[PDB]
Design a binder for this molecule. Structure first.
Ligand SMILES: [Mg+2]
Ligand SMILES: [Mg+2]
Ligand SMILES: [Mg+2]
Ligand SMILES: [Mg+2]
Ligand SMILES: [Mg+2]
Ligand SMILES: [Mg+2]
Lengths: 136, 106, 172, 190, 197
RNA sequence: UGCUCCACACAAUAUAGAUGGAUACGAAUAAGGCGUCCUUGUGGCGUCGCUGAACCAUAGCAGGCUAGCAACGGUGCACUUGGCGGAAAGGCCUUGGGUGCUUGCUGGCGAAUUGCAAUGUCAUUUUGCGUGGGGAUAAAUCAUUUGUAUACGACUUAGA
RNA sequence: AAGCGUUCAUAGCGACAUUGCUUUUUGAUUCUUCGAUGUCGGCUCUUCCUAUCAUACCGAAGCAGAAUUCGGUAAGCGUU
C-alpha cells in the first residue's frame, strides 16, 4: 500500500559539518567546515580545539554525524561562539565513537602494574559472568 | 603462564642488495609489529638471535644460535638492517629470528 | 615547488651618464624561490624592453602574501601557453583561498588537460572575480549555489594491515 | 566535468506501490507486478511524498548522468506498464504469398507459427516470453497484437517476430514481404 | 600473525591479491586461498576473454605437450598469476610456492576456519565505481573449466550448513553479551572502566 | 620365529623454521550488521562501524608443597550417550558419571651460588632396536606356454 | 575531389596533387661467412600469414529475377 524506499542517509559536506582530523598537525581534533572550496577541498576551523583556519583536503578528514547552525564563510570568532553555544564538544564526547577513541588512548597509557590489575580484575569479572551462563 | 616470550618475533627477509648484487654482510629483518621507521628506532642496537637445531650435539645441546644486532632502519616500513657475527646462511630467508629487549634504555 | 610564491621583482636598466635614474620596471612573478623569480623576471623583460641581465639591475625582491589567506574566493586567470603546434590564449577559473595556490592548481590543470609544462605557460593575469555572476564557468558556478550540500559516497578506508578480518564496508 | 548533483523525479499514480531495495525496483499496480534489477548504475533512490520518488547522482560525469535519465525512464515504463499496459500492433505485408500466422503449442511454450512466408516451406517459430499475451484482432486484415505488462518483454517479442521474417538473397526494397511493427501503445488508453 | 592465513578469494582483484600473496609467501607466511571462482579482474568479460585467447594460442610449435600449459581452473589461473611474481625456478621460490594452497569453493578443513580479506586487493575498495570487471568463474568456464556447476552446488550446500551455524552462534552471543551487560555497574566492572577495559 | 597394529623405553635421524589462540554466516558496498517490536515486510524503531589498537586467554619451583573460605561454576584427562559432517568427510556438536586443577577470595612453607648475559635447551617428523598385549597366515617375477601382440622389452592367454 | 557515371563527385570509378604500408621484385650497401653455411628448378611433406579465389553468415548497388560488382567478420576448410 505504501511506497517503501530505503533512504540511505549520508554525512553531508556542508557549512557547520563537524570533522575529525586524522592526518596533520591536528590529527585527532575537531573542526567545523566553514566553506566548501571544491569537491575535494573545504575550509575548516577548530578554534576551541586549536585547529587554525585552513584549507584542507577531504581525504585527510573524517566527517562526523555532528552538525550545528553556522553561516557560510563565518570567521573564527563567529565559529567559536556557535561551537560553544551548540555544545559540539559535549555531543561528540558522549558518542560511542569518541568513547572508543578515549578507550584506545586509555589502554595505551596503561603501565605494567595497571595491566596486571586488569588481568586479575578481568578474571574476577568473568567468574561471575560464566556462572551466570551455567545457572541460566 | 603459557607465554614466556621476552623477545619480539621477527622474520629474516633477505640481504642488503641492489637489483642484481647482494651484500651478505647485512641482513634485512622484519620486526613483527612495526610498520614505520620511527617505530624501528626503538629497536636500534637490540640483540637479535637466530635459533636453529642440529642433529649433532655440540656442548650438551642440540640447539645453536647466531647473534646479531639491529644497526639502522631500512625503507619506510619498519624493516631494519642487521649485522650478525656470522652472516645468516640465506636459506633462513623467511625464517624466524628473536629480537630481544636488551640492551635496554626503556 | 612545494608551494608557489608570488614576488614583486622591480628592476631597471643600468644608469648611464646621459640617462641616470631609469624607469624602474616592476612585475609580479610566480616562482618556487627567489632565484627562479629573478630568472623569470628577465625572461619577460626580454619580451618587452631592450634590456638583459647584463645591461640591467634588480633593485627590489619582495615576497607578496595574501591579504586574506583564509577566505575562499573565485579566481579568474588568463594564460597564454604553447601547444605542440601553436600558441593559444585561454581564460580559466579556480576556486581557492590564495593566488599562489590557484596558480598551483592552474599549473596542474594545464599539465593534466593540455600537457603544457611550466616551461610553456605565460601567466597573463590572475584576477579574483569581485562579484558573483561574472563567473563564466559551470564548474565554478556550481559551487556558488545557495545552501550547497553534497555527500561523499563510497568511502575507501586505508588499512594499516595487509590482512583484515571483517570484509569492510564503504558507508559514510 | 563532474556535476555536484543531478536529479530526476519519478511520479507515482495512486494504485502503484514502489518499493526500492538496494537497487532492485519493484512496481506493483493493477495489472500485476514488475520487478527490475538496477545494480549497475550506482544511483540513490529517495521518496518524497508517496507519489513522487527521486533518483540522484552525486559527483557524476557525462556518461553517468546520462545513465541517470535512463533509469528514470525504466522506472517510468514499469509504472506505466502496470497502469496503462503495453500493447503492440503489427501488420502483415506480402506481395504474392499470404502469410499464415497461428499460435500453436509444443510442450506449453505457445510459439508464433509463421507459414508460407514468401512461399517458404520452412516453418517459422517464435516463442512467447512469459508474461506476454498475443491475440489476432478483427476489423483489420492480417494484423497481430502483442500485449503485456512490461514494454521490454513485448517490444522484444515484437522484434523477435519481425526479425524472423527477414528476406534473404533478394533486393529487400522490392521484396518488402514481412511482419512489421505498425503501432506501439498501451492496452488502456481510451 | 596467524600460523596459516586463509583468504576468501571472493571480491578480490586477481593481480593485487597475487602481489600480496607472493610477498606473503616469500616472507615465510603460509597462505590458503579459497573460493577462487569468485575472484575478479578489471575490464569487461569479453576483453579479458580475448586476453586469454591470445595466451591460448602461444605454444611450442614442434610439440604442444612441452609448451606453455594453459590451465583452465580459476584456482590455477590465480596460481598462474602468482608465478611471475615469484622466482619459481629457484629453491627459495619453490619453498615459497609450497606455502600456498589455492582452492575452488571452500573445502574442509577450511569450511570451519576463519577467513580474511585483503583490503588492498578488494575490488569494491579499489575499482572506481562504474568501471567494468570480470569474474573468474565465468572466464574459466568460457575457456573450458568444467566444474562451475559442481562448485556452486557444493558452495550453496556449505552456506546452508554455515548459516545455521551462525544461527546458534547469534543465540549464544546474545546470552554471553547479556550476562556481561548485567555485570556492568558492578564494583569490578567500574574499576576496569577506569583502566580502559 | 617372518609381517602388521597398540602402548612405552633407548639410540639415531632430520626440520623452508611452534615459542598464548588459523578466533568459521551469507550477500551488499549509491549499503549493511546487531537488538527489539509488529500486521511478518524490499517493515518500523534504536544502536554500531570511522578497523584486529579487537576478542578470548593470560599470576603460581617453564609454574612447586600445603591450609581454609565462597560457589556448584570454569578448564584438562581418559571413559562415555546420541547426532551430524564424503569437496580433500577424518572434524563438529552433544550426553552422563569419575578423576585432577582452579589465580573467585584469604593464608603458611620453599626457590638463592646459572654467581652481572650467553637459545640456556621444554617441539614434531622419520628410522632402527627392545619389552609386553592383539591380529592375519599372500603373491609377483624369471623359466615353460598362447598369438587377439610383437624389432627387443612390452602386451594378451594356459599350467599343481 | 576537377571530372566520368542519361541527371548524380563519392553505386562503381576518379585527374591534378598528397600521406602511407610491405619486404614475395629489382636496385643500393658490403655488416657476417672465402682453414667452404652445398647453388637453380621440380618432386615430397608440414606449418604459418592474410593483402579472401571458393565455401559460412552478412551489409551496399546504377540489387525487379537471374547473373554480377563493391564491402565486412572470417585463414575453420579447400584451391586440380
Ligand atoms: Mg631477497
Ligand atoms: Mg639495500
Ligand atoms: Mg538477413
Ligand atoms: Mg539475386
Ligand atoms: Mg634461465
Ligand atoms: Mg582480413
Amino acid at each position: 500500500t505504501d511506497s517503501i524506499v530505503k533512504a540511505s542517509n549520508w554525512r553531508l559536506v556542508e557549512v557547520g559539518r563537524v570533522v575529525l582530523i586524522k592526518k596533520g598537525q591536528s590529527a585527532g581534533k575537531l573542526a567545523a567546515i566553514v566553506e566548501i572550496i571544491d569537491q575535494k577541498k573545504v575550509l575548516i576551523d577548530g578554534p576551541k580545539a586549536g585547529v587554525p583556519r585552513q584549507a584542507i583536503n577531504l581525504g585527510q578528514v573524517v566527517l562526523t554525524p555532528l552538525t550545528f547552525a553556522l553561516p557560510r564563510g563565518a570567521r573564527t570568532a563567529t565559529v567559536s561562539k556557535k561551537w560553544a553555544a551548540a555544545a559540539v564538544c559535549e555531543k561528540w564526547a558522549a558518542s560511542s565513537w569518541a568513547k572508543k577513541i578515549a578507550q584506545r588512548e586509555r589502554r595505551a597509557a596503561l603501565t605494567d602494574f595497571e595491566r596486571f590489575q586488569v588481568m586479575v580484575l578481568r578474571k574476577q569479572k568473568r567468574y561471575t559472568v560464566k556462572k551466570a551462563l551455567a545457572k541460566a | 603462564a603459557e607465554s614466556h616470550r621476552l623477545y619480539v618475533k621477527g622474520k629474516h627477509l633477505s640481504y642488503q642488495r641492489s637489483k642484481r648484487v647482494n651484500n651478505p654482510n647485512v641482513s634485512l629483518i622484519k620486526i613483527e609489529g612495526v610498520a614505520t621507521p620511527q617505530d624501528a628506532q626503538f629497536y636500534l642496537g637490540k640483540r637479535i638471535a637466530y635459533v636453529y637445531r642440529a642433529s649433532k650435539e655440540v656442548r650438551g645441546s642440540k640447539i645453536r644460535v647466531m647473534w646479531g644486532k639491529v644497526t639502522r632502519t631500512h625503507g619506510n616500513s619498519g624493516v631494519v638492517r642487521a649485522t650478525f657475527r656470522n652472516n645468516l646462511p640465506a636459506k633462513t630467508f623467511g625464517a624466524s629470528v628473536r629480537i630481544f629487549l636488551y640492551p635496554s634504555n626503556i | 615547488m612545494a608551494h608557489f610564491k608570488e614576488y614583486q621583482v622591480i628592476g631597471r636598466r643600468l644608469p648611464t651618464e646621459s640617462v641616470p635614474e631609469p624607469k624602474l620596471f616592476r612585475m609580479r612573478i610566480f616562482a618556487s624561490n627567489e632565484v627562479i623569480a629573478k630568472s623569470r623576471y628577465w625572461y619577460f623583460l626580454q619580451k618587452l624592453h631592450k634590456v638583459k641581465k647584463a645591461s640591467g639591475e634588480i633593485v627590489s625582491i619582495n615576497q607578496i602574501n595574501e591579504a586574506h589567506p583564509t577566505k575562499v574566493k573565485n579566481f579568474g586567470v588568463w594564460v597564454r601557453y604553447d601547444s605542440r603546434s601553436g600558441t593559444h590564449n585561454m581564460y580559466k577559473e579556480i576556486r581557492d583561498v590564495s593566488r599562489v595556490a590557484a596558480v598551483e592548481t592552474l599549473y596542474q590543470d594545464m599539465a593534466a588537460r593540455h600537457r603544457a609544462r611550466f616551461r610553456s605557460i605565460h601567466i597573463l593575469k590572475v584576477a579574483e572575480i569581485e562579484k558573483t555572476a561574472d563567473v563564466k564557468r559551470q564548474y565554478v558556478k556550481q559551487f556558488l549555489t545557495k545552501d550547497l550540500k553534497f555527500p561523499l559516497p563510497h568511502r575507501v578506508q586505508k588499512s594499516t594491515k595487509t590482512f583484515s578480518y571483517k570484509r569492510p564496508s564503504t558507508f559514510y | 566535468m563532474k556535476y555536484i548533483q543531478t536529479e530526476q523525479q519519478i511520479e507515482v499514480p495512486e494504485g502503484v506501490t514502489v518499493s526500492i531495495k538496494s537497487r532492485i525496483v519493484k512496481v506493483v499496480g493493477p495489472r500485476g507486478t514488475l520487478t527490475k534489477n538496477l545494480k549497475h548504475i550506482d544511483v540513490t533512490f529517495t521518496k518524497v511524498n508517496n507519489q513522487l520518488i527521486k533518483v540522484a547522482v552525486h559527483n557524476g560525469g557525462r556518461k553517468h548522468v546520462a545513465a541517470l535519465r535512463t533509469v528514470k525512464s525504466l522506472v517510468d515504463n514499469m509504472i506505466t506498464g502496470v497502469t496503462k499496459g503495453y500493447k503492440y500492433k503489427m501488420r502483415y505485408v506480402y506481395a504474392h504469398f499470404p502469410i499464415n500466422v497461428n499460435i500453436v503449442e509444443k510442450d506449453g511454450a505457445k510459439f508464433i507459427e509463421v507459414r508460407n512466408f514468401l512461399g517458404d516451406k520452412k516453418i517459422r517459430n517464435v516463442p512467447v516470453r512469459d508474461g506476454v499475451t498475443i491475440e489476432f484482432s478483427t476489423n483489420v486484415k492480417d494484423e497481430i497484437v502483442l500485449s503485456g505488462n512490461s514494454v521490454e518483454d513485448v517490444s522484444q517479442n515484437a522484434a523477435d517476430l519481425q526479425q524472423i521474417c527477414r528476406v534473404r538473397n533478394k533486393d529487400i526494397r522490392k521484396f518488402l514481404d514481412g511482419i512489421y511493427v505498425s503501432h506501439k501503445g498501451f492496452i488502456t488508453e481510451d | 600473525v596467524e600460523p596459516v592465513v586463509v583468504i576468501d578469494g571472493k571480491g578480490h582483484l586477481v593481480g593485487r591479491l597475487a602481489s600480496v600473496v607472493a610477498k606473503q609467501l616469500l616472507n615465510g607466511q603460509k597462505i590458503v586461498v579459497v573460493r577462487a571462482e569468485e575472484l575478479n579482474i578489471s575490464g569487461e568479460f569479453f576483453r579479458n576473454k580475448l586476453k586469454y585467447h591470445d595466451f591460448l594460442r602461444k605454444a611450442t610449435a614442434f610439440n604442444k605437450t612441452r609448451g606453455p600449459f594453459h590451465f583452465r581452473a580459476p584456482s590455477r589461473i590465480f596460481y598462474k598469476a602468482l608465478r611471475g611474481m615469484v622466482s619459481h625456478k629457484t629453491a627459495r621460490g619453490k619453498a615459497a610456492l609450497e606455502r600456498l594452497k589455492v582452492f575452488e569453493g571452500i573445502p574442509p578443513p577450511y569450511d570451519k576456519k576463519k577467513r580474511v580479506v585483503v583490503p588492498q586487493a578488494l575490488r569494491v575498495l579499489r575499482l572506481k565505481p562504474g568501471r567494468k570487471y570480470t569474474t573468474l568463474g565465468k572466464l574459466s568456464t568460457s575457456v573450458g573449466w568444467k566444474y562451475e556447476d559442481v562448485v556452486a552446488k557444493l558452495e550453496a550446500k556449505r552456506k546452508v550448513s554455515s548459516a545455521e551455524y551462525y544461527a546458534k552462534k547469534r543465540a549464544f552471543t546474545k546470552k554471553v553479551a547479556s550476562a556481561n551487560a548485567t555485570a556492568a555497574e558492578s564494583d569490578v566492572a567500574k574499576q576496569l572502566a577506569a583502566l580502559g577495559y
